[PDB]
Symmetry: D3
């Protein structure tokens, strides 16, 4: 009956993301994780890998499903039969830009956006910083799900 | 099944508040508006009046109910059988303090807080500023529900 | 006697921009809209089109003129015989960077910068977001002047 | 023809304030400094003293006048025959609250608010902090006009 | 040779404070915790209790000492023979005000202020919020040192 | 015994940077300025020039040394035998991103980051803005050390 979409590029999914997925799943009947296609083909992990990593990291959430997103997030949301987006806040989130998009999204499609602060212990990880630190030899394994750590280790090896 | 609490002093409720109530009511099975008791007895409208104003302003939301809150918001939330708080963001919201409380609330009770930006047209009204402007002769009637405007006019007359 | 410059790339001009033009025109004897040349040739609309769109959108402001800007904004301002820049604030404005530039501009040329918040209804449109939403099929026509909507429709068709 | 109001409590006026007065005076035909009456009678300097200090500190600005303000700033502004307020930004300014008031002021009276960053050297002085530091023995004389320093010294002696 | 002062009211000291004390103690030869006297006599714990709680919570830091502060922080710092203040940042810190004071402190006494972010797990506790939550029955014992928890329990009992 | 690292690209070093170097040098036994290698080869000044400019600008600080940094800042810091990073704050600093990195750096290496506000007069210069203004003909010589001004003049001539 109720449903939320959690959109992002998830390249790769972090435990900050999983924290938000868990909170959405506890508060909405259904959650869809929408993985957005990388535009100018510039990510670390390809689409199939990103899907697998999210799936493997959310087996404990039976009301959550993973789908590839295309086009405007709001079009995806309304195609899911939902009218809510749930987005996490962390240290370094461009909140003003998130607010601009939220207001635009409301304006064009009537879709609401609910923001929720990620757990403090996961509040400083982002996909980009995690990748950059890992590529330079740093240990971010406590900030990422094990399905991601396995793949990250493989690529770096 | 799902439920959110919208806590505040609502002295008086504004159309910014009503906007948030509407969005919560559209996304959760049940919404409880929790009116917090004024501590050192310093408000404009007494408790009965604040309750009436919220009730009269939300007759179009059948899954919403109004209750007086006492003690920690999280205790109230869990007594409602819920684990979510929904709070609006407007211009002038002390967001950093809201974030601090959200993290504390999560820590002590496991209760999640979802923030949602109020509609732009209602983004600059707050109970305090509305009262201050009205007391000095300014017209804020477009920013408040008619049940509030009626009472505000009476008190000022 | 008094004069302000409103600089930007205006690719394309939005109703947020027009709101600021109107306020500048009401408060200064003369307003010059300075359209800055796109550096690495990467915009949607070419210079002639951007000029036309601003002109066509400001026919109701007889003390406003449109000019192409080159080089430092402050050099342009002082060449106009003015010493004031007027810039709008919206949701998503990089205000800290605007402040840095304002202080630098004051330092190098003695030119003052006055910031003014755009109307709430136009506070979430930006040229970039408007283009991105339009390219993906979203309706932003309420946020742009009709001379822009006409051209945007043509390019998308 | 053009005119701006610079409202505040000016208890006492600082060189940050004078910087803003100077910029307003350079960009508008007329400037009115509106000294707001202290509500619950809690300031350091009484109204006559605040007026004198502003007057004595602005003798070099012949298009500026000082007046006592009463009621809503916007009512004062429109009574001056103006529709613009000019406010300074410094370190510690509650900008979000200033923005809320600006949007409210626009809404109720159509009055525009222009914000301008104070000079870096005067960006950390405020009336409150200056008083608090002076009362505890600190030298803030470089941050205040000499007419204020004279009076501050007298009161502390 | 090197020395930093950590000033505050510490009513009571939290584990966020202790985190900052630890980092200061690791980076400076000597650290002085300066407990500021409560002005209008409005705290929860009296001076002797606040001193005891800080002392009892920092026995593992032999280069740290606790002293009562009086007057301007910068006067205290320079009386300690130091020229550095170390202050923690947490969620809800009024950073703009901290920056204003830092710039003022530099201006009047040449004293530098170094800010350091508290550990994420302790980033949402503040003395005020901890007291307010405890008074309303909430468990904040994981966020405060045991010497504080002992005293807090006693007062609440 | 105590030591801090001041990392950056310093392309070129500004007086804002030198201000921070001076404060670090006054508060720590040793300071290392770590010049990070430009990734995709895109700077104005090459590595040898950046080193020379920092050296020539810090001859008055005998406890400061300049080194080329490689890899994670925290790896460099710990290789210096230190556990502190000192970073300046100016107008336009992406503080939220600096905070994210600080928390990540603490997490992966136990290294503390101390932030210190640059002097107001140097608070609006950044390497990027200085270069952009200089390339367009503006005079930024008061914001940069003379060793930089000499080289900047040569390149522009």
């Amino acid at each position: 009956m109720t449903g939320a979409v959690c959109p992002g590029s998830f390249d790769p999914v972090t435990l900050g993301h999983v924290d938000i997925f868990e909170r959405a799943a506890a508060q909405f009947d259904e959650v869809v994780v929408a993985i957005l296609v990388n535009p100018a083909k510039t990510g670390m992990f390809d689409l199939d890998e990103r899907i697998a990593m999210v799936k493997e990291s959310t087996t404990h959430l039976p009301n959550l499903r993973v789908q590839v997103g295309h086009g405007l997030v709001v079009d995806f949301v309304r195609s899911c039969g939902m009218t809510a987006i749930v987005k996490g806040l962390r240290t370094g989130t461009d909140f003003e830009y998130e607010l601009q998009m939220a207001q635009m999204n409301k304006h064009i499609a009537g879709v609401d956006t609910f923001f929720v602060a990620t757990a403090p212990r996961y509040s400083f990880v982002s996909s980009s910083l995690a990748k950059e630190v890992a590529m330079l030899g740093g240990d971010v394994s406590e900030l990422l799900p094990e399905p991601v750590n396995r793949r990250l280790r493989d690529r770096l090896n």
